[PDB]
Design a protein around this nucleic acid. Structure first.
Ligand code: 5GS
Ligand code: CL
Ligand code: MN
Ligand code: MN
Ligand code: MN
Length: 536
RNA sequence: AAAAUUU
RNA sequence: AAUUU
């Protein structure tokens, strides 16, 4: 029935200019050599993306769907949710949010300039009066950095971002922000992934695993999820929103956004031409994340039911899903998973790669990450979260006139501090760089490099400084990724680390603490690391 | 472009 | 600011 998009043939033009790497990358040329492999997805590539996501959806629901949808509305209605004042919504706007066509941007919105507020007032008026005229949206290519992979095609084409004008974005928040804060957790409970921290994610998975007599796990991800979302899914989304206690004024705003924006509309490129027409999710609207998550969850819980998955414990984040169930033997597990996929496929959520039962927690990947295990200081098993370092390393080498990658180095150091690739490679590089630069004291992304030990002890536990005996999968994957980007292998990073360590120690102060906690892995005779005052 | 988590 | 979807 529904085509996902149609296209005039106008191009998807760039919003800014898309910078090139330069013949010299002075921050990362000591980190890796293969700079030719590191690229940013361009707007020229958007054409290729559009072909891959334009297709005809058909959808066939069933008693299991209906049943799951019903139960989900009974959950929804134990929720009441308020409108947000025009003003409170204005100030959830991000500081750099793309400006409005009507002569103001986010500074004005956040400061409640009166031109901005009056335009927003009229926009909300029109939402309440007119509940049908479609609302124009802008279409743009997302710029992100990867490492080329010739196995899987060369370069990925850019994903498509589709969004309404700033005025409209504020009105969405007025109508729905409060819902986004309450509905998913109410509807999905413990299954709602975003509620958890990484530590909690890991623990939730181990508890789920431990409680099965005989566990089986898998993960699922939908190919081009936003384009698989049907008009009917979006209206069913509305009807889930409506099932809460709402002010009548919200209901009209919800219903109107739904019919005017969410289910479809025309799309314009940055130069103003009509680009095409859309009848799936616009990724760029306030409801993108909540919607995806709720919709994914309905389809998934139904498909579990269609396929016989026993005692499923779920975890859902957007279109990404893990299910840990009671195995019915491998012959049955294979068959049930094929059934799961058939169902999701009927529901219009077809797999990127077909899923597969697993019986070892390390082999389940979701949101480009997985759980792994090492040994702690006293020899106890320590479970932690990690990932292929390929992309983060490529992003670590993205230097342009307009972009430094140092913040990315730090981001990953914090998020993945227990991993062997952060501890040996990124930490070593980061500290080496700043020492020589003599900018340790300086803040970056509102964090002081010299706090890191406290920060990591707070977030990952003191065990992140003493972990050893990493897994084969993890050693293999790391070695393989450093070889792939032409970076030095782990032994060299051991040498560089000893030096960085010595120089930090002999600097005294917080540096020396950094050098002793972060790099104790690097010395032959360890120290005994005690908790840190600063952390509690 | 939107959200969540981390800080 | 970082990461993720
Ligand atoms: C664009 C999205 O709606 C997207 O389709 C969905 C699932 O992401 P995915 O990583 O599995 O990609 P597919 O589209 O399924 O190929 O998460 C949203 N999403 C994802 C990435 C992003 O920057 N913004 C976004 O709103
Ligand atoms: Cl231990
Ligand atoms: Mn997907
Ligand atoms: Mn309605
Ligand atoms: Mn996904």
């Amino acid at each position: 029935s529904s085509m996902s998009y149609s296209w005039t043939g106008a191009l998807i033009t760039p919003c800014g200019p898309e910078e090139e790497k330069l013949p010299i990358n002075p921050l990362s040329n000591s980190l890796l050599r293969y700079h030719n492999k590191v690229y940013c997805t361009t707007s020229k590539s958007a054409s290729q993306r559009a072909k891959k996501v334009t297709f005809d959806r058909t959808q066939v629901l069933d008693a299991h769907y209906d049943s799951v949808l019903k139960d989900i509305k009974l959950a929804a209605s134990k929720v009441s949710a308020r409108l947000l004042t025009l003003q409170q919504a204005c100030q959830l706007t991000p500081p750099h949010s793309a400006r409005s066509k009507y002569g103001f941007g986010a500074k004005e919105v956040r400061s409640l300039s009166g031109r901005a507020v009056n335009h927003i007032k009229s926009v909300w008026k029109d939402l309440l009066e007119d509940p049908q005229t479609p609302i124009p949206t802008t279409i743009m290519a997302k710029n992100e950095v990867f490492c080329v992979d010739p196995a899987k095609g060369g370069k990925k084409p850019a994903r498509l971002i589709v969004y309404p004008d700033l005025g409209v974005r504020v009105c969405e928040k007025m109508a729905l922000y409060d819902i986004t804060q309450k509905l998913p957790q109410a509807v999905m409970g413990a299954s709602y992934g975003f509620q958890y921290s990484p530590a909690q994610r890991v623990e939730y998975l181990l508890k789920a695993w431990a409680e099965k007599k005989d566990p089986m796990g898998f993960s699922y991800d939908t190919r081009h999820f936003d384009s698989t979302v049907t008009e009917r899914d979006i209206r069913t989304e509305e009807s889930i929103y409506q099932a809460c206690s709402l002010p009548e004024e919200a209901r009209t705003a919800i219903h109107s956004l739904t019919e005017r924006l969410y289910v479809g509309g025309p799309m314009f490129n940055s130069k103003g031409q009509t680009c095409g027409y859309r009848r799936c999710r616009a990724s760029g609207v306030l409801t993108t994340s909540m919607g995806n998550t709720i919709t994914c969850y309905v389809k998934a819980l139904a498909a579990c039911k269609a396929a016989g998955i026993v005692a499923p414990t779920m975890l859902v984040c957007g279109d990404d899903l893990i299910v840990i169930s009671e195995s019915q033997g491998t012959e049955e597990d294979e068959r049930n998973l094929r059934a799961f996929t058939e169902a999701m496929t009927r529901y219009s959520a077809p797999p990127g790669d077909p899923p597969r039962p697993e019986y070892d927690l390390e082999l389940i990947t979701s949101c480009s990450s997985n759980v792994s295990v090492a040994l702690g200081p006293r020899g106890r098993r320590r479970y932690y979260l990690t990932r292929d370092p390929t992309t983060p390393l490529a992003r670590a080498a993205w230097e342009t006139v307009r972009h430094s990658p140092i913040n990315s180095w730090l981001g990953n150091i914090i998020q993945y501090a227990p991993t062997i690739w952060v501890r040996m490679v990124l930490m070593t590089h980061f500290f080496s760089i700043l020492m020589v630069q003599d900018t340790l004291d300086q803040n970056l992304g509102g964090v002081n490099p010299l706090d890191l030990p406290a920060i990591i002890e707070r977030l990952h536990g003191l065990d992140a400084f003493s972990m050893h005996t990493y897994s084969h999968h993890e050693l293999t994957r790391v070695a393989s990724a450093l070889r792939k980007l032409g970076a030095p292998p782990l032994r060299v990073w051991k040498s560089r680390a000893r030096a960085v360590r010595a120089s930090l120690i002999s600097r005294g102060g917080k540096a020396a603490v950094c050098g002793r906690y972060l790099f104790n892995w690097a010395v032959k005779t360890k120290l005994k690391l005690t908790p840190l005052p600063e952390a509690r």
